[PDB]
Structures are given as structure tokens and as C-alpha cells.
Design a protein around this ligand. Structure first.
Ligand SMILES: Cc1csc(CNC(=O)c2ccn[nH]2)n1
Ligand SMILES: [Zn+2]
Ligand SMILES: [Zn+2]
Ligand SMILES: [Zn+2]
Length: 459
């Protein structure tokens, strides 16, 4: 059960308007053949063009929704739409391009997929709501064969060039004209009633149906993200490292310890309500405070309602002390809170577009996050940058320029001159903070938080 057997049945009902008379009895083997591809009993790493839902979930970064709309066929021009917002018109002689022959369209497809996917994945997974034209058009821009490696590097080949007869990955495909060994999955095989728009609109109001192929390509990938990440959650699936994953995770842990430790020193709360991960650990283990944990898994659909998290009868008095919501996405935070909330609008190789304004944040594990909403933070303010340290001023053991900063809250800065140790530590902390912010995280705190209250912890 590693790959999808070519002898598996393919439901052809959704294909019979573009392909009238299509046999009801159909396998992947006969379908790939009908599409104009020959597999030739090849045991060479590419057993099927189509993959399982489980293999698709493991390769979510490679997903590219794809739709082809005809006219009134090899007589009519076709509009090719991708979930990148691109629409290309192919002739057989929201970015809208006028009609061009396949020999130039294929060149543009290779460029577009390579630029979208080079920093995301080692492949492309065409996400379909198959009606016929998208499958019969693949022979015009896709070549298949044995698994290969890039001509300029060790990555698997994703493109082919008829000009030089060579193969390339997404990073080395400039000038390549064919998509090599792509993958694909037909969402319509999962058991749905009604068309694409009616199933998509049950869960999402952010994507419309402007009647261009890219709108359908966008809805198809959104519907697949909903089915695989919103209504079905698998936090056991691991995803490869493609960027700053480790630095960001280390930075988040550093910022969390810093912000919570300073909030407890500045306001001396007697109790802290830690709402979120059921496996959470005290981020400030030495703090005096009464630490109380409340379990809530990451919400992937809609943000938690504070009324359901807090009410229906625990300290019961969440109004006492401070509440900590570290990536616990709620509709409206209470005024006495410390909050880390992921901003779904952030553009990054870790953040993929999601369902209903939400985003799919993929960092070791895939987490669909509900749409960022500025009104969740109305009882709070943005947490300002600051570095706090009560550790001794001692170097131990990278050349220096003296640090001058009003936000370096240390004994040495109180005393007029930041020491080398606290200056190095401040700069490392500022780097970790900037990495977390730029990765998409936002920090919020109760309105009374004032770092001026940290200076008297050095007396
Ligand atoms: C050349 C050509 C063929 S189809 C087309 C315009 N697209 C649509 O009509 C449509 C319907 C749904 N999505 N797209 N242009
Ligand atoms: Zn390469
Ligand atoms: Zn959608
Ligand atoms: Zn110091």
C-alpha cells in the first residue's frame, strides 16, 4: 500500500460531459493509456501518475490546483488555469494571457511551476476536479519515464528539455519545455455530491467563481486542503526542512520565556492560566506563580470561542492573574492576557494558502490556522520589543561595538553602560525576535504592561 495501484478503479462519471461514451469500468492503467501515455511495465520509481490521498497529504507543498475549460477538443482553444492565479490560452493551430500554441504554452508552464515550487518541494501534484479536458491536455506539456536526477544537481528531475535532451529539477530548469514525471490526484474520486462550487462554498467564502479556469483550480486545491487538513487532522506526519524551521522554533521558545518571565516580574500575578497545548511545559520554570494548565488542541477550522473555553463551569476565576495563549487561537482574548497568534497573511515558504482565509503553516507538522482577525485583540495592545536579563554581567570565553539601547533592560544599562555579555545576548535575542515576527507570529499583551516596571528588579 505504498503507491496507488494502476489496477485501481477510477470513477468516470465526472469525465462523461467532455468525454461522452466513456466506459463506466475504468482503471488508472486504462486512463493513463487514454491520456496518451505509455508506462511500458516500468519498475523505475514512477509506478503511477496518480497518487493516494495519504501520499498527497505528505506532499501538500507540491499541490497545484489545475483546471482546463473548453469552448462552445483539438478544434477549439483551451483555457488552462492554475491555483497560482495564472490562466493561459492554448490554441491547436486572475492573470489572463491571449491564445498561443502548445509549443510556447509548455515553456511558460515549466517556468511557472519551477518558480512556485523550487523552494517548496521536489515535485508537483496537480490537484484536479477532473472533467476530461485537463487529463487529455497533459500530453501537450508532460513527459513521463523512469525516475531521474537533475543534470546540474542531485535533486530528482522535474523537467525535460527537447532542445538539449536533458533533465532538470525546479532550480535548474531555465529554458526547459516539458514537465517531467508530475503527480496528480482527482478530488472527485473522494465521494462528493454535486459540482465543485457547491462543495467548496460549504466551507469557504474567500474564493469566488469568476468563471475563469484559475478560479476552479483555486477552489479545487482549497477543497482538498479542507478535506485533508481542516476536517481531518494528522499531527503525526512529518515534513522535510526547507527553510528556517529550526531557528524559528528556537526563537519562539526564547521569546516565550522572555515575555512571560518579564510579565510575571513587572506585574507579580499570583496565578497564570496556561491555555493551549495539552503537552505544554512551564516556559518560566523558576517563576513563583501558581501555574495552571488547560488543554486545547490547535483549532484548524474556526477560532475557539472564549465562552466555550472558559465557561460551562480549574481555577474557574480566569479573571485572577494572567492568561497565557501561546498559539491558542481564540475569537476574543480577555484583557489580562499574553498572546502569540500566527498571522495567516504572512508570505513565506512555510505558509501555504488555506481554506476560508486561513493558512496551512507547515513547520515539521502541518497546521491549518484560522484567518487572522484584528478584532480578537481589541482588549490588548501590541507587545513592544524589549530584552530583559537579570543574569550576572560576566563575559566568559566575535568582535565588539558598544551597545546603546533603551530596550536592553539590564543592571549594566541601569548603571549607564551595557556590558559585553548582555550586548551579545541582546543582539542574539533581537535576531531571534525578528525571525519569529518575520515568520508570521504576532505578540499581544494586557494594556498595563510596561517595561518601566522591570528596572526596579535590580535593587
Ligand atoms: C479560450 C477559453 C476556453 S474557456 C475560456 C473561459 N473560461 C471559462 O469559460 C470558464 C468557465 C469556468 N471556468 N472558466 N476561455
Ligand atoms: Zn538541479
Ligand atoms: Zn476556498
Ligand atoms: Zn551586563
Amino acid at each position: 500500500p505504498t503507491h496507488l495501484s494502476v489496477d485501481t478503479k477510477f470513477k468516470t462519471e465526472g469525465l462523461c460531459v467532455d468525454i461522452p461514451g466513456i466506459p463506466k469500468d475504468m482503471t488508472y492503467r486504462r486512463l493513463i493509456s487514454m491520456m496518451g501515455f505509455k508506462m511500458n511495465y516500468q519498475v523505475n520509481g514512477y509506478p503511477n501518475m496518480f497518487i493516494t490521498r495519504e501520499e498527497a497529504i505528505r506532499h501538500v507543498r507540491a499541490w497545484i490546483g489545475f483546471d482546463v475549460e473548453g469552448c462552445h477538443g483539438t478544434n477549439l482553444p483551451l483555457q488552462l488555469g492554475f491555483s497560482t492565479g495564472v490562466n493561459l490560452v492554448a490554441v491547436p493551430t486572475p492573470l489572463m494571457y491571449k491564445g498561443l500554441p502548445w509549443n510556447v504554452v509548455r515553456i511558460k508552464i515549466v517556468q511557472m511551476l519551477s518558480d512556485t515550487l523550487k523552494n517548496l518541494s521536489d515535485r508537483v501534484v496537480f490537484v484536479l476536479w477532473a472533467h476530461g479536458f485537463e487529463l487529455t491536455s497533459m500530453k501537450y506539456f508532460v513527459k513521463i519515464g523512469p525516475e531521474r536526477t537533475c543534470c546540474l544537481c542531485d535533486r530528482r528531475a522535474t523537467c525535460f528539455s527537447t532542445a538539449s535532451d536533458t533533465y532538470a529539477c525546479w532550480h535548474h530548469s531555465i529554458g526547459f519545455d516539458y514537465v517531467y514525471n508530475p503527480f496528480m490526484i482527482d478530488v472527485q474520486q473522494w465521494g462528493f455530491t454535486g459540482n465543485l462550487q457547491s462543495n467548496h462554498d460549504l466551507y469557504c467564502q474567500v474564493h469566488g467563481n469568476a468563471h475563469v479556469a484559475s478560479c476552479d483550480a483555486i477552489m479545487t486545491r482549497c477543497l482538498a486542503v479542507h478535506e485533508c487538513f481542516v476536517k481531518r487532522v494528522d499531527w503525526t506526519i512529518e515534513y522535510p526542512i526547507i527553510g528556517d524551521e529550526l531557528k524559528i522554533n528556537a526563537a519562539c521558545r526564547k521569546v516565550q520565556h522572555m515575555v512571560v518571565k518579564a510579565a510575571l516580574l513587572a506585574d507579580k500575578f499570583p496565578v497564570l492560566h496556561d491555555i493551549g497545548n495539552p503537552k505544554a511545559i512551564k516556559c518560566v520554570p523558576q517563576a513563583d506563580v501558581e501555574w495552571k494548565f488547560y488543554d486545547a488542541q490547535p483549532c484548524s477550522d474556526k477560532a475557539y470561542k472564549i465562552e466555550e473555553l472558559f465557561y460551562s463551569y480549574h481555577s474557574d476565576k480566569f479573571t485572577d492573574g494572567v492568561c497565557l495563549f501561546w498559539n491558542c487561537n481564540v475569537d476574543r482574548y480577555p484583557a489580562n492576557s499574553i498572546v502569540c497568534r500566527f498571522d495567516t497573511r504572512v508570505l513565506s515558504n512555510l505558509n501555504l494558502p488555506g481554506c476560508d482565509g486561513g493558512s496551512l503553516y507547515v513547520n515539521k507538522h502541518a497546521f491549518h490556522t484560522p484567518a487572522f482577525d484584528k478584532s480578537a485583540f481589541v482588549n490588548l495592545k501590541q507587545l513592544p520589543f524589549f530584552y530583559y536579563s537579570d543574569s550576572p554581567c560576566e563575559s566568559h570565553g566575535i568582535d565588539y561595538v558598544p551597545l546603546k539601547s533603551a530596550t536592553c533592560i539590564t543592571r549594566c544599562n541601569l548603571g549607564g553602560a551595557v556590558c559585553r555579555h548582555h550586548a551579545n545576548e541582546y543582539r542574539l535575542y533581537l535576531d531571534a525576535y525578528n525571525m519569529m515576527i518575520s515568520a508570521g507570529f504576532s505578540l499581544w499583551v494586557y494594556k498595563q504592561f510596561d517595561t518601566y516596571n522591570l528596572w526596579n528588579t535590580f535593587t
